[PDB]
Structure 1
């Protein structure tokens, strides 16, 4: 169920990982590879590599492993003879769903629907979740402008050759620091790192500032309100400007906490006021919970903290949820089939696993546990921040979704490398931040284990 602590045999990557990396690098650029893994031996919060190292994994495959490695409840699912068909007969779900499709959706995604959103479409990853949410929003916007009218002859002819009016020049507004995926639509709304964006054609869509809070929060209450207000004003200005340019903003996308761009937080007030700005200008409000969703902030969806009855029009998800997709309000339901569509629309085998994951999260109270273990973690980070101000700053988080900055990227990288060799896997986000993304079976004692290991690391650093 759970190993007792990490156990290191070699530096990481070790000799066997380096050999496999060399082989992989023949067929593709393999420079991003950290090391090669023995998933069969990995269990709970512990990842085992091919050199026999066992590390405490606080990165969880870029936040996508919900209840740990080799979870016994999922092992038993794969072992049931009745589930074999689900793994080897993949349907074109849009046209030929399996008998249990709706019941399995009730056991899983529908049991955790966000407030106000009765509709659900499934997708296989976070990028096609967001792309199809964009499309759903453009279709809804044009519907407001035209319907209940038929498509015009001119629209139908021009859309086949990539021309207006069939292909409108509408826009989605996004934020600096955002990350929403890397397919060409998503990528236009992504503003994380130059290397993600460069040499790829884009869209002239509006880009607003996301707030940069000053820390510690109790000392900058007024400065941070002013910063949030200034950003809200620029959002509203942009929407007016792009309407004048004939590039109407049909929707606004935002993450509840910006991840890849550097764990940027903002107050619940900011998001509430942003939701209002959205409604006020007839913009669909798209909340991207691909990384924040699934419980690590202490609530199943992070937008739940805003306490709104109408938090959004569309919400996308993936990663911990195993499958992707988006919930949406009834009024965003496409008016005809084959507009939001692709071959597979997810995968029933992922829904099979997700239903059991959701069952475990509920039965074992793991939302509460993330709040609790996350408070232990953050408390400890604040203490190390106090004791090592020359290395640690802007300690921040919600639930286990925590982070801090280091003075620069070289130190960030050195700390992550040292930590890994000591048995703890950490992720970097932004320039010089270190981020935590523990699985949902991360408990108090894992937090205390990390803190005691990292404390020793700082003392020797």
Structure 2
């Protein structure tokens, strides 16, 4: 199920990794590569590299590995002779679904549906989930505007040649610091780092400020309320402004906690109010749970913390969910087929795995475990913040979805690189934040292994 701690043999990347990185660099830019991995010997919370290093992995493949490496329940699925077809016969799911398609959805995604959302379409990744959510939103908005009326001849003609009125000039409102994917529609809503954006054509869609909270929260009660109120006002102003531009805001997309752009949090009140603004202007409210979804905040979906019966119109997911897709309200159902469609629409092999993942999450009480392990982590980070104010500030988190700031990008990267050599894989976000994305099998004792390693690193830095 898991090893008893990290065990380092070499610097990371070690010589076998470096050789493999040189080979890969011949066929593509390999500069992002951390190291090469032995996934066969990886177990639980521990990633083993090709040099035999064993690291406690608190990044989990960018928050995408739900119940650790080489999970014995998932091993068993692959071993069952009856499952072989699912792995080798991939269907065009929009036209030729397997006999068990609906049942395996009942065992998996439908069992964790968000409140108010009776509909589900599956997609293979987070980007195509958000792209198709946008399109779902645009078709719904245009359908509100036309009744009743059929598509017009002018609409049918102009859409084929990329013109209005067939192709409307609607927008999705997004936030500074957001990350929603990198295909060309997703990208216009992404505002994470310039290198993600530069040299790519975009859309003129409104971009609102996301609150920047001040820490410690108890010492900034009024200021943080004011900051959130200012952002809400600017959202509403943008919706009004873009309606006058004839670039009507059909939807608002937001993450419950901004990830790639710097682990930015906002109060549950901010979200409830944002949801109400969206409804008031007839904007669909699209919650992107690709990274927050799947339990690490201590609730299956992070938006569940908000306590709403009607939390959103559309909610996308992927990463830990193995498959992508989006849940949505009945009113957003496409009116005709072949509008929201692609060849594969996910993969039944991933739904097979996810159903077992969800069973394990329920049976091992891993939601509540993530709240607990996360509190233990956060407490320890607060202790380190108090002892090392020259390096650590703005400690913050929900569940195991935790982060802190360092003084600058150069110290942020150095601390990540030293931790890795000492046996712990950390992620970065923003210009100078370190983030945690532990698998759901991360326990309080793993929080301590990390804290004790990192305490020694800070003492010697």
**TM-score for both structures, normalised by structure 2:** 1.00
Deviations 1:191-244 (A, max 9, x none): 000000000000000000000001110100100000000000000000000000
Gaps of 5+ in 2: none
Q: CA deviation at 1:122?
A: 0.1
What is the alpha-carbon distance in structure 2 between the residues aligned to residue 451 and residue 47 of structure 1? 18
Deviations 1:363-411 (A, max 9, x none): 0000000000000000000010011011000000000000000000000
Q: CA deviation at 1:91?
A: 0.1
Q: CA deviation at 1:442?
A: 0.2
What is the alpha-carbon distance in structure 2 between the residues aligned to residue 163 and residue 233 of structure 1? 33
Deviations 1:307-350 (A, max 9, x none): 00000000000000000000000000000000000000000000
Q: Give secondary structure in 1 for the equivalent of 2:326.
A: strand
What is the alpha-carbon distance in structure 1 between the residues aligned to residue 409 and residue 216 of structure 2? 22
Deviations 1:171-196 (A, max 9, x none): 00000000000000000000000000
Aligned to 1:448: 448
What is the alpha-carbon distance in structure 2 between the residues aligned to residue 196 and residue 423 of structure 1? 29
Q: Give secondary structure in 2 for the equivalent of 1:397.
A: strand
Aligned to 1:457: 457
Q: CA deviation at 1:64?
A: 0.1
Q: Does 1:139 align with 2:136?
A: no
What is the alpha-carbon distance in structure 1 between the residues aligned to residue 108 and residue 274 of structure 2? 30
What is the alpha-carbon distance in structure 2 between the residues aligned to residue 3 and residue 138 of structure 1? 49
Q: Give secondary structure in 2 for the equivalent of 1:412.
A: helix
Deviations 1:105-132 (A, max 9, x none): 0000000000000000000000000000
Q: Give secondary structure in 2 for the equivalent of 1:40.
A: coil
Q: Give secondary structure in 1 for the equivalent of 2:157.
A: helix
What is the alpha-carbon distance in structure 2 between the residues aligned to residue 353 and residue 23 of structure 1? 32
Gaps of 5+ in 1: none
Q: CA deviation at 1:33?
A: 0.2
Deviations 1:144-175 (A, max 9, x none): 00021210000000000000000000000000
Q: Give secondary structure in 2 for the equivalent of 1:83.
A: helix
What is the alpha-carbon distance in structure 1 between the residues aligned to residue 147 and residue 73 of structure 2? 49
What is the alpha-carbon distance in structure 2 between the residues aligned to residue 217 and residue 336 of structure 1? 48
Range that drifts further, 148-157 or 284-293: 148-157
Aligned to 1:300: 300
What is the alpha-carbon distance in structure 1 between the residues aligned to residue 120 and residue 366 of structure 2? 24
What is the alpha-carbon distance in structure 2 between the residues aligned to residue 449 and residue 416 of structure 1? 16
Aligned to 2:109: 109
Q: Give secondary structure in 2 for the equivalent of 1:402.
A: strand
Deviations 1:232-286 (A, max 9, x none): 0000000000000000000000000000000000000000000000000000000
What is the alpha-carbon distance in structure 1 between the residues aligned to residue 262 and residue 252 of structure 2? 20
Q: CA deviation at 1:454?
A: 0.4
What is the alpha-carbon distance in structure 2 between the residues aligned to residue 231 and residue 390 of structure 1? 31
Q: CA deviation at 1:88?
A: 0.1
What is the alpha-carbon distance in structure 1 between the residues aligned to residue 199 and residue 147 of structure 2? 39
Q: Give secondary structure in 1 for the equivalent of 2:174.
A: strand
What is the alpha-carbon distance in structure 1 between the residues aligned to residue 80 and residue 309 of structure 2? 40
Deviations 1:42-89 (A, max 9, x none): 000000000000000000000000000000000000000000000000
Q: Does 1:168 align with 2:160?
A: no
What is the alpha-carbon distance in structure 2 between the residues aligned to residue 221 and residue 49 of structure 1? 45
Aligned to 2:283: 283
Aligned to 2:87: 87
Q: CA deviation at 1:300?
A: 0.1
Runs of 4+ in 1 over 2 A off after TM superposition: none
What is the alpha-carbon distance in structure 1 between the residues aligned to residue 92 and residue 123 of structure 2? 12
What is the alpha-carbon distance in structure 1 between the residues aligned to residue 380 and residue 148 of structure 2? 58
What is the alpha-carbon distance in structure 1 between the residues aligned to residue 221 and residue 137 of structure 2? 35
Q: Give secondary structure in 2 for the equivalent of 1:110.
A: helix
What is the alpha-carbon distance in structure 1 between the residues aligned to residue 90 and residue 323 of structure 2? 14
Q: Give secondary structure in 2 for the equivalent of 1:92.
A: coil
Q: Give secondary structure in 1 for the equivalent of 2:371.
A: helix
